[PDB]
């Protein structure tokens, strides 16, 4: 049976098993259970990555070192590979004969312990062809007698769904809970393991690098547990050195490299922003101001919030920024958000909230429809952010959506984490949240019944209070009220559409030239404060795009030629020169 089992004592004495630092309380309890007259079978139940197998294997390391009670000295721990027990047990009784042979060896010596990792796998392993004589049944009687000692290791999920179902087997095993360690005791673990990782990668770690790897991983890496969540960084940090040139910092790894690794694992922007990002960040306001005019206050809020986060002054657990964009039509509420994603080169998560008006549709954001038997038990909002943690989240026309959606965002803005029905948590700490609403648009469009016209901007705010609950509005960073487009910015808006037209025309091979007088004429005809910038596109479409379209298709522009537009003051009508070729 030497093939099926492995002697941890022998393996630990020569190569090493990644020694167990601390965990004195757990080992004392385990040894207490192992010294029991009967049912002396400890079970190390804990979350993944909490050192369940380091305690059982570490116990062997302590025995050879001698740091154990005299009762434990001279004991040999054997690890069971169930894959080898069931290797060639095709014929009836091969497994039972093979398995029982192993038990006789343990009972005969009476000073040997058996370690079964993933112990939940002995509940249905090679029992029979539609029979109930399983390995668990074969070990059960021996366990109660106390002739042999068996150490188990299994996750909470497996222990309850599988191991707990067999009440008889669970009775024999004494559940020893294992808890995730704290920050302080965790750094001691890495320090003790560090010599094994340093030699493997031929690197050295600083005192501050280890402290940072632990603290940073806890902050950003939320889908793992601390003992291993902090060793992935350490292990991955050393590997980076090997890939780099022999002359490029191979000897040691500093705190700067550690934060780089965490950023890649969590797909979040790394600290110590490069000068490249700074140039884009400083110019972020100016770049946005070249595509959206008259809304400098909104752009400042978005850019400043991003700067605070990168600088390190961002919210501890809240998102980068939560905003509500309320304003008249065509004022750039959605355009600024769409262009923000392009300026930052990050994914845009645009959710149209007019499709979530129904209450049942809100469960899709954080779950699946009731009674869905398939595999896609995920939420569109939770999975989107999980796939793109660093992104811009746009909830267009959120006021249309059911009030339940607001309640779903309370934890998104106050705590930064939204949990799916399955129980996985998403991170919104780097996702810029921008909401857009047209509340009070009718109030602004209508005119007050009075000698003096009234600014209905305040009426929209009162509507915002009625629609949104106070808790939801308090969490928001700020409620930006977009303002109507003035005649001055409209001239800039017309220039924006004209360049967009030129880009479309460039593919066709035709170049458009518009005189300044013509551009002003377009603005006056299409200017509508109430309707914003959208009428400007329509006037340009009716006046400029229409003549060009007929010519491009029906003649004088099939082949690329220059175009010139001018205004006739006498006729107060535009003119065009097609000038083919």
């Amino acid at each position: 049976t030497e093939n099926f089992t492995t002697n941890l004592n022998q393996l630990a004495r020569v190569g090493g098993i990644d020694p167990l630092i601390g965990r004195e309380k757990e080992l004392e309890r385990a040894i207490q259970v192992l010294c029991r007259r009967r049912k002396n079978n400890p079970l190390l139940v804990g979350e993944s990555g909490v050192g369940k197998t380091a305690i059982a294997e570490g116990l062997a390391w302590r025995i050879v070192q001698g740091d154990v009670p005299e009762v434990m000295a001279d004991c040999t721990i054997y690890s069971l590979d169930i894959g080898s027990l069931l290797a060639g047990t095709k014929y009836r009784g091969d497994f039972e004969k093979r398995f029982k042979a192993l038990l006789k060896q343990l009972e005969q010596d009476t000073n040997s312990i058996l370690f079964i990792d993933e112990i939940h796998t002995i509940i249905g392993a090679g029992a029979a062809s539609g029979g109930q004589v399983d390995a668990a049944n074969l070990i059960k009687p021996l366990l109660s007698s106390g002739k042999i000692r068996v150490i188990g290791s299994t996750t909470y999920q497996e222990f309850s769904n599988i191991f707990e179902k067999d009440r008889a087997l669970a009775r024999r095993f004494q559940k020893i809970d294992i808890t995730e360690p704290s920050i302080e005791e965790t750094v001691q673990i890495i320090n003790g393991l560090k010599p094994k990782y340093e030699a493997h990668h031929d690197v050295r770690y600083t005192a501050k690098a280890v402290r940072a790897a632990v603290e940073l991983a806890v902050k950003y890496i939320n889908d793992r547990h601390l003992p291993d969540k902090a060793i992935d960084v350490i292990d991955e940090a050393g590997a980076r050195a090997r890939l780099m040139p022999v002359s490029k910092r191979k000897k040691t790894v500093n705190v700067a490299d550690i934060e780089s690794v965490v950023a890649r694992i969590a797909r979040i922007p790394e600290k110590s922003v490069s000068q490249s990002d700074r140039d884009t960040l400083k110019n972020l306001g100016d770049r946005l101001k070249m595509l959206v005019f008259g809304q400098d206050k909104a752009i400042e809020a978005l850019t400043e919030a991003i700067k605070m986060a990168r600088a390190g002054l961002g919210h501890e657990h809240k998102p980068v920024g939560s905003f509500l964009f309320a304003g008249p039509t065509g004022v750039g509420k959605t355009e600024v958000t769409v262009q923000l994603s392009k300026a930052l080169g990050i994914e845009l998560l645009r959710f149209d909230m007019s499709e979530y008006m129904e209450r049942h549709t809100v469960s899709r954001l954080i779950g699946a429809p009731p009674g869905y038997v398939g595999f896609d038990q995920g939420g569109l909002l939770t999975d989107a952010v999980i796939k793109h943690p660093h992104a811009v989240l746009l909830l267009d026309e959120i006021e249309k959506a059911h009030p339940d959606v607001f309640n779903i965002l309370l934890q998104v803005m106050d705590n930064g984490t939204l949990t799916d029905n399955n129980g996985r948590k998403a991170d919104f700490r780097n996702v810029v949240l921008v909401m857009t609403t047209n509340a009070g648009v009718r109030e602004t469009e209508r005119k007050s019944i009075g000698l003096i016209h009234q600014d209905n901007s305040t009426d929209a705010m009162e509507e915002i209070k009625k629609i949104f609950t106070p808790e939801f509005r308090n969490r928001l960073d700020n409620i930006i009220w977009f303002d109507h487009l003035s005649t001055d910015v409209i001239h800039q808006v017309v220039d924006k559409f004209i360049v967009e037209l030129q880009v479309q025309l460039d593919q066709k091979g035709v170049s458009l030239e518009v005189s300044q007088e013509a551009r002003n004429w377009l603005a006056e005809k299409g200017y509508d404060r109430a309707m914003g910038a959208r009428p400007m596109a329509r006037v340009i479409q009716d006046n400029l795009k229409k003549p060009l379209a007929n010519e491009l298709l029906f003649g004088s522009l099939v082949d690329g030629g220059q175009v010139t537009v001018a205004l006739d003051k006498e006729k107060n009508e535009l003119t065009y020169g097609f000038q083919s070729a």
Binding site: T89, K90, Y91, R92, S129
Partner: peptide, 11 residues
């Protein structure tokens, strides 16, 4: 549906 099968040789 997937069930293991244990065989036996004739002799």
């Amino acid at each position: 549906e997937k069930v293991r099968d244990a065989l036996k040789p004739p002799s």
